[PDB]
Design a protein around this nucleic acid. Structure first.
Lengths: 590, 588
DNA sequence: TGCTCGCCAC
DNA sequence: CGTGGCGAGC
DNA sequence: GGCGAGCGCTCGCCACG
């Protein structure tokens, strides 16, 4: 009677409409459109939302079926059309739009009808042949005959759609760079909402934000399908639209935001776009151009500081191998090493490349450029080998089976989620504490907005310092009981850090915290609090333990062609320093 | 002083009364009613007809205004009541009947009176609330209070009304299903022919009555559908469906099967078949494609009624399976049986074939290849399309061709050619000696017009006239047209639009441009297959009156697409050497 | 084919 | 001020 | 041709920056 998708859509509208500063990002005609939506019948509201969730494009009216709403949708379509929310095929005026709507057999059929050569050609080829054929006019005729085949067709009008689209964005900004159906059914974590800052300066700021989003979505799509040439041109235009925008007043206010909010601005999105542009240029072998763009990204310090390590490291790689330019390479590593935002994984990666360069014929002469190098070296781990199966049932599953043979009856393979879940269970009320401005912006967040930022720790330092000492010296019964508290009071609530299914039971989690002990846990929680983005990624694939003796090993698992990455090497050593027993398990090919 | 509606009503009575066998389809009291009507006063006759043309429903006497009948209608009402033609509110005893008679203020007023919750509700909601409330009776009280509001009121008595109703039907059978007696009657001059009865259409008085009630039901259902009342339309059809199978092998049907096709359309079974055919459209509007298909298979499983419709049926059946149902092999079977069926005329045939080609040529259907082997190679040629950028979509096209040098032009659709056909072949279309096509003096067309036997019954005269037209020089064409025009202008023929041409001269100029071969071709198609020919003809005919260049144009705006029939006829005209075009108007 | 719009005697 | 929710007429 | 109704959308009022 009152279905989930509508309920969830109604919640979102209510929230955004409630907030006056958000409403300042719409002009009067746009506000009027939301009003008009509210004026629609309930059957009208249902159809619009079912169409708004669909791909923005025409759909066949005989494929519309929502029996619970109306047996025959025609008069509802009519209402939505009269109100300016939907169009019918009367407004189908682009040949490409209609050619996009037709299936393959149909397109083929139409092709034979017009005596189109090579009709067996793939859809893009057919569409292009028709369109070219129209450039002999004839286009109008191909159009009408296609529409006859399509039958009655409807599309959401793009004006109103983009309004709701930007409202969506405003409601959940952290999903933009990451609609979700389950919303009616998911239980969210507890916290008190506390909003303090305007994120978007104005209507136009939102619109530029939205267009950046769609571009990023376009480019991503192209890359996924191996269309790197198309991906490049779209990126180059996007690149042009960004420089053509840098000048705008709203950016000045974005630059004033702390990092964990700054990620929800137009500029941050284009920076992400530029970062993918780097990968695209390389796939296309344009290593020269990739390098200037990298130097450009690295020359500014407002956006994506978290990414700098990835950038420096790729820049060096392109110089060292792609460009073979040895002295700027050394320069790069030294600046990179000097960059305080680079976390230890990429740092180790950069250094490792310096050593490599300082020790081959190529670089004997530049000896005086290598003096600044710190002697940051990383400890040795214990290494075993096992045989594989296949060409593979999951490497990790094979490892797990072997350690169960070696007397480790318990074992988990959540990667970073293992520890991050324990972190979550031990520090829940601090992660979600009140008094920290702007970290909670709606009641449907899975995490504080500053979580993956340096200011997470600095903003909760007193509480964090007191909790980490309390864990470090906590008795085993304390550890188990703290975990149980959070587990019992929060189980099911959706927290991005926590995997409610990672452990088979509270008891398993209690047994694990007992084996790890307070000192280790404290060490791990400190690193995650202090530097979450970097820390989360280098954690061992596996934890296995003997439930009687509480002997445990934290295992990184490596098949053929699999080798420790820099981050993983930095973390295995750190764990080893906390006295935890660590191992690298290699599966060998069968 | 003697108005059209009465004149026309008098003609209808005259015609039916004239035929003694038709009069046998009423009993004595019913005949007596018609006598009493003729007994009724001239002011009386006027009021009765004005009320007979209204819905069968109560009317307030204080809402009656007909100064042309009487300044005070009270005694006229009284005459009609005493004679048993109207009933007054003394016989108003049904709650629903009275609740249907009240307007909005009144229903609201009554609502306050009985302490109804929401007297501000809409009328139908109030009517329904009162009627439910009456299901507790208290009906009598709601009735009297409603009548107090209505005032003095009358309704046409249903017995006598149904007699006149069947008389009307007998006069003009092709008005009965028309929805899916006419006014001029005193003033229209009808074509010449000889009156010719040879078959009884109705086996008995009862068969006629069942026929008439089927007609009214079909008319009811059709009305509902037209208003988008598809749910009510469905129920009505379901009942009608029940009444037909409830009757099926009844004695009267045997005699209906004996009738030639052009009378068979005036029998109960044919009407229910039409009803079931609307049933198909209803089920599809309701998306009930499963149920639609059994009904189609059922209508196609009998071959006594509506062979004209078989093409529509086959084609819809194929589409429903091919789309939505997606059941590929029976679809192919269906199309092939359809294509095999000699009743299917060329428009739907083309439509069926088109669908076969589509199915025969996609990966989904490679395997069924052995089911396509019988396929005849009936193909229809591709025509040329031009485009230009409301006002008059037809009017815009007309203006454009005037700019392109075609100073004359007619937005005539099929009536343009059908009118020319009429003017060139009138005396043969209406020639004497052909049994059963002319049954009374008030027909607008021969009864066999829409039937196979139209052509076969006039074949020798047609063959000789079509050859004569094929070789006719301009001057012959102009002269023949003028002859018929001058001797028949004004006569009501359904084929002929006396206003389609601006003048005789325009029609003569057009026949001069078309020439004999084209005209011959057109007349042959219309004679051979009139129903199908009439519908597919181009929206426009435009011509240059000096050079006699003409173009036949079909016009398509946004959301406007060539139908199968139109594609078949553009090709045919092109084959006769006429220049044809499809003109698309694109949005500005 | 736009279109806001639904019938009832003339 | 400027804005837009927002409740009575054609 | 007559309208009997339905009925969804402007114009002012207030609040809220």
């Amino acid at each position: 009677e009152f279905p989930y998708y509508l309920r969830s859509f109604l919640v979102v509208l209510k929230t955004v409409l409630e907030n006056e500063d958000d409403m300042l990002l719409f002009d009067e005609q746009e506000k009027g459109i939301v009003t008009k939506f509210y004026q629609l019948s309930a059957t009208g509201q249902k159809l619009y939302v079912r169409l708004f969730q669909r791909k923005l494009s025409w759909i066949k009216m005989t494929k519309l079926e929502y029996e619970e709403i109306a047996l025959d949708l025609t008069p509802v379509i009519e209402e939505l059309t009269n109100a300016g929310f939907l169009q019918t095929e009367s407004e189908l005026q682009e040949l490409s739009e209609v050619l996009e709507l037709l299936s393959a057999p149909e397109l083929k059929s139409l092709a034979k009808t017009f005596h189109l050569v090579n009709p067996n050609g793939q859809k893009q080829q057919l569409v292009d042949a028709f369109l070219k054929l129209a450039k002999q006019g004839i286009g109008a005729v191909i159009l009408k005959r296609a529409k006859a085949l399509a039958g009655q067709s409807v599309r959401i009008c793009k004006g109103p759609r983009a309004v709701f689209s930007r409202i969506l964005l405003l409601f959940s900004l952290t999903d933009s760079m990451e609609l979700l159906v389950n919303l009616g059914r998911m239980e969210f974590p507890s916290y008190t909402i506390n909003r303090k800052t305007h994120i978007f300066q104005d209507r136009d700021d939102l619109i530029r934000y939205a267009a950046a989003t769609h571009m990023l979505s376009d480019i991503s799509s192209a890359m996924a399908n191996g269309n790197w040439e198309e991906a490049k041109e779209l990126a180059q235009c996007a690149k042009r639209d960004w420089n053509r925008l840098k000048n705008h007043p709203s950016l000045r206010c974005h630059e004033d935001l702390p990092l964990f909010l700054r990620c929800f601005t137009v500029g941050w999105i284009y920076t992400r776009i530029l970062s993918r542009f780097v990968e695209i240029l390389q796939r296309l072998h344009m290593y020269e151009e990739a390098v200037r763009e990298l130097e450009s990204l690295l020359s500014q310090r407002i956006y994506c500081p978290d990414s700098r390590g990835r950038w420096w490291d790729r820049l060096a790689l392109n110089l060292h191998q792609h460009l073979k330019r040895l002295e700027p390479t050394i320069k790069c590593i030294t600046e990179g090493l000097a960059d305080p935002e680079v976390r230890t994984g990429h740092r180790l990666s950069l250094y490792q490349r310096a050593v490599r360069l300082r020790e081959s014929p190529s670089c004997k002469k530049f000896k005086h450029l290598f003096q600044q190098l710190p002697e940051m070296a990383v400890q040795d781990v214990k290494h075993v080998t096992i045989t594989g199966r296949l060409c593979l049932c999951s490497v990790e599953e094979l490892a797990l089976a072997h350690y169960r043979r070696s007397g480790f009856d318990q074992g988990i393979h959540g990667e970073g989620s293992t520890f991050s879940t324990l972190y979550g269970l031990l520090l829940w009320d601090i992660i979600f504490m009140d008094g920290i401005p702007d970290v909670f912006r709606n009641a449907c967040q899975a995490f504080p907005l500053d979580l993956c930022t340096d200011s997470f720790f600095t903003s909760r330092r007193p509480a964090l310092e007191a909790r980490l000492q309390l864990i470090h010296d906590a008795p085993e019964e304390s550890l188990r009981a703290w975990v149980a508290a959070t587990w019992h009071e929060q189980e099911g609530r959706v927290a991005s850090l926590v995997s409610w299914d990672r452990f088979t039971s509270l008891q398993q989690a209690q047994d694990l915290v007992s084996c790890l002990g307070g000192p280790v846990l404290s060490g791990v929680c400190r690193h995650l609090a202090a530097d979450f983005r970097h820390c989360r990624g280098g954690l061992p694939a596996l934890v296995v333990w003997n439930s009687q003796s509480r002997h445990f090993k934290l295992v990184e698992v490596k098949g053929p062609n699999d080798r420790l990455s820099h981050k993983q090497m930095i973390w295995l050593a750190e764990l080893q320093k906390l006295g935890a027993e660590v191992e690298v398990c290699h599966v060998v090919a069968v």
